[PDB]
Amino acid sequence: MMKGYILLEKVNIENANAFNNIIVGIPAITSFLGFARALERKLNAKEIAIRINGVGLEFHEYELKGYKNKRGQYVTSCPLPGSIPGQNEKKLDAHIMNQAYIDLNMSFLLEVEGPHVDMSTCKSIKSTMETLRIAGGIIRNYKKIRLIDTLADIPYGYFLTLRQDNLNDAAGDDMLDKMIHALQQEDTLVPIAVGFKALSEVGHVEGQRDPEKDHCFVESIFSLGGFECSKILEDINSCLWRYKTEEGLYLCTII
Amino acid sequence: TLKSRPENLSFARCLNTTEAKFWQTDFLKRHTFKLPLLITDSQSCTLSTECDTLRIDFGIKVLPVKESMYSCSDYNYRTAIYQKIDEYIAEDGFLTLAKRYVNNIANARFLWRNRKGAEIIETIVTIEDKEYPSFNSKSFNLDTFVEDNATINEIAQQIADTFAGKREYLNIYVTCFVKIGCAMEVYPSQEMTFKGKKLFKFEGSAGMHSQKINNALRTIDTWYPDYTTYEFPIPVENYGAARSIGIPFRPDTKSFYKLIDRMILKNEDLPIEDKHYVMAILIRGGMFSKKQ
Amino acid sequence: KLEKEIMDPNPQKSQSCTLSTECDTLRIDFGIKVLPVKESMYSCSDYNYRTAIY
RNA sequence: UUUAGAAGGAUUGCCGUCAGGAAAUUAGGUGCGCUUAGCAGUGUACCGCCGGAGGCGG
């Protein structure tokens, strides 16, 4: 019954997950969209009807936990492991698996659709964001939660957008060769993770987190992305990530 | 044929005024006696006990109006200007304007504050080696213009003939005697400080700037739109303005820029009063250019 | 700009030069040196052009 | 309802010895800065006076 835009401005996230089996860097888009969905689910239990249908991701600064060597390469750092459940839980030294962590400052543009979208909604989002996480990281501080109307009320930064056309129109003989060639031609693009693909059928197995839902075994899928500034942008709708679900595919796309 | 003013247009002056110098004098022995008057350190200047008369000496140079253009980047506009000037010298030989300029000398307006509170003011005008009969100064109002005085007519004829072009120069020397009384203040012009009132010294003595006297002589404009309401002469300016009372008397289509881009760009015959004002601006001078 | 600044003063710096009250004439002195025209060619990277000019 | 949920990297330390940068030089010709102006704005406010703090006379 009404539609608007809410901006979450300059949020500090400390120690967010940065490993997706072929990528070390920016976290996957599904974590940010799940943060938006978790905020939606927590606002609807306080009897405040709202629906978040699109999120835009803006970047201001980053820091990867580690250091840069003299040759210009990164060496990651991980915390010291503690007690882990299993057969060797009573030991003093535990195992070291594969992990990576990142630090971010970002801003979020949320498209909300509900019966009322005033500043009391902004106060409720301010009261409901001090009990949530982004990726697996904690929120130290935010600056201000406010409503926006046009492109000129947005702070300066660089947004992330999908560039699937630059991947389907390149090289050949397999998709990974297209990925490597497209990354060698234009140097301002990054590989990102954009959702999941099925590896089995839907059913019920033993050992689930919730034993009353449907279950599928999945694999992560990867695509290409790029950065555009906030003063060279056309429309709000061309930087908003949304959910899309086919049969066997769970994705995140910019229509 | 013509679309705009050129990118470089300038006019020089035709009324050059010297700076003034002050003296002390006694009235009954005025033509045998003269003493300097100096500034006494604010700064202030006051007449001596033994004297009761201020004396002002300055001179004016009169130059022709055609031969007063310094730069023009388009020959056609120059020919148009010379044609309009010869059309003016056909009708009126620069004679009404010159009568008004001699009237400002006769009215003794150049004594700005020094005119109030005097008892006898006399002014004698010297041209060549002839001294013309003096003036009474307190029989001429500062808001009218006499047109029947013979000596004023005789000076104004020569001034008008020199502006026309029938003579190439004229040098006019004027002396003024103002009786204010012993130990009274003289009020000279004040300098510009980029604190304290610092007065102006010329050759050790005191005097007025030439700009202040030239402002006095140019108060000859009685052809402005709202003349009937406020009936007082205004000094001649482009966007016609009077610092006395806070009002632009010419903001718009009666200004100089439009009235000159309505005479030379669009050859329309203007009324005689507007032609008087345009020629008076050309006897004043300035930079009149246009970007592009 | 004309609405907001038509009556606003304008201080300006300048310089001037006038005579005294006891003098009426100006005196200007300067000098000229005249040199030959064939001996006024400072640089030329081709001797034939110099011979043609001469 | 986020490749979810959890984590102490620690202690110690002698970089040192020696030394020739060096020789040569052509920066040169020309030249229009310049037309206008009021240091004004008001040019600054003095003695008192009772009161005791608070209020009028010249």
DSSP B42-85: --B-B--TT--EEEEEEEEEE--SGGGEEEES-HHHHHHHHHHH
Residues of chain B with a CB closer than 8 angstroms to some CB in chain C: 18-19, 21, 57, 192, 194, 203, 239, 241, 243, 246, 248, 251
The CA distance from B15 to A87, in Å, is 112
Tokens representing A216 are 């599928």
- Chain B: residue whose CA lies nearest to C5: B248
Q: DSSP letter for B244, please.
A: T
- For residue A22, give every residue at least 6 positions away whose Cβ sits within 8 Å of its Cβ, in sequence order, or none: A191, A222
Which chain C residues are within 8 Å of B19, Cβ to Cβ?
18
- Shortest CA gap C36–chain B (Å): 36
Which chain C residues are within 8 Å of B243, Cβ to Cβ?
7
The CA distance from C54 to C50, in Å, is 6
Tokens representing A73 are 């390469």
- For residue B10, give every residue at least 6 positions away whose Cβ sits within 8 Å of its Cβ, in sequence order, or none: B69, B70, B71, B285, B286, B287, B288, B289
Count each helix (H run) and each strand (E run) in chain C, helices first. Answer: 2, 0
Alpha helices in chain B, H assignment, sequence order = 75-91, 95-107, 150-164, 210-217, 256-260, 272-282
Write out which nucleotides of chain D lie closer than 7 A to a protein Cβ. 1-9, 28-29, 34-40, 43-44
Reported as type and span, the H/E element at residue C3 is helix C2-5
Place of tokens 């947004």: A159
- For residue A186, give every residue at least 6 positions away whose Cβ sits within 8 Å of its Cβ, in sequence order, or none: A166
CB atoms within 10 A of CB B61: 15
Which chain B residues are within 8 Å of C1, Cβ to Cβ?
none
Q: 3-class DSSP state for residue B283?
A: coil
One-letter amino acid for residue C18 of the chain: T
Resolution (A): 2.5
The CA distance from A205 to B141, in Å, is 116
Q: Please tell me the number of Cα atoms within 13 Å of B20 on its side-chain side.
A: 24
| Nearest nucleotide (CA of A77 to C1') | D9
Beta carbons of A238 and A222 less than 8 angstroms apart: no
**Which residues between 7 and 26 in chain C have a beta carbon less than 8 angstroms from any beta carbon of chain B?**
7, 11, 13, 18, 20-21
The CA distance from B252 to A130, in Å, is 64
CB atoms within 10 A of CB A70: 5
Our CA angle for B152, B156, B160, nearest 5°, is 175
SS (H, E, C) chain A: CCEEEEEEEEEEEEEEECECCCCECCCCHHHHHHHHHHHHHHHCCCCCCCCEEEEEEEEEEEEECEEECCCCCEEECCCCCCCCCCCCCCCCCCCCCCCCEEEEEEEEEEEEECCCCCCHHHHHHHHHCCCCCECCEEECCCCEEEECCCHHHCCCCEEEEECCHHHHCCCCCCHHHHHHHHHHHCCCEEEEEEEEEECCCCECCCCCCCCCCCECCEEEEEEEEEEEECCCCCCHHHHCEEEEECCCEEEEECC
Beta carbons of A128 and A48 less than 8 angstroms apart: no
The CA distance from B251 to A112, in Å, is 55
Beta carbons of B5 and B77 less than 8 angstroms apart: yes
- In angstroms, the CA of A71 and the C1' of D2 are apart by 35
| Nearest nucleotide (CA of A99 to C1') | D3
| Residue B12: closest CA among B287, B285, B288 | B285
Beta carbons of B248 and B31 less than 8 angstroms apart: no
Beta carbons of B66 and B165 less than 8 angstroms apart: yes
Q: DSSP letter for C1, please.
A: -
The CA distance from B278 to B276, in Å, is 6
Place of tokens 């000596």: B151
C-alpha of C54 from chain center: 32
CA distances from B125 to B106, B120, B155, B252 (A): 10, 17, 9, 40
Tokens representing B268 are 């329309």
Tokens representing B275 are 């032609």
Our CA angle for A188, A59, A42, nearest 5°, is 135
The CA distance from A198 to B188, in Å, is 100
Four-point Cα dihedral B135, B136, B138, B144, nearest 10: -40
Method used experimentally = cryo-EM
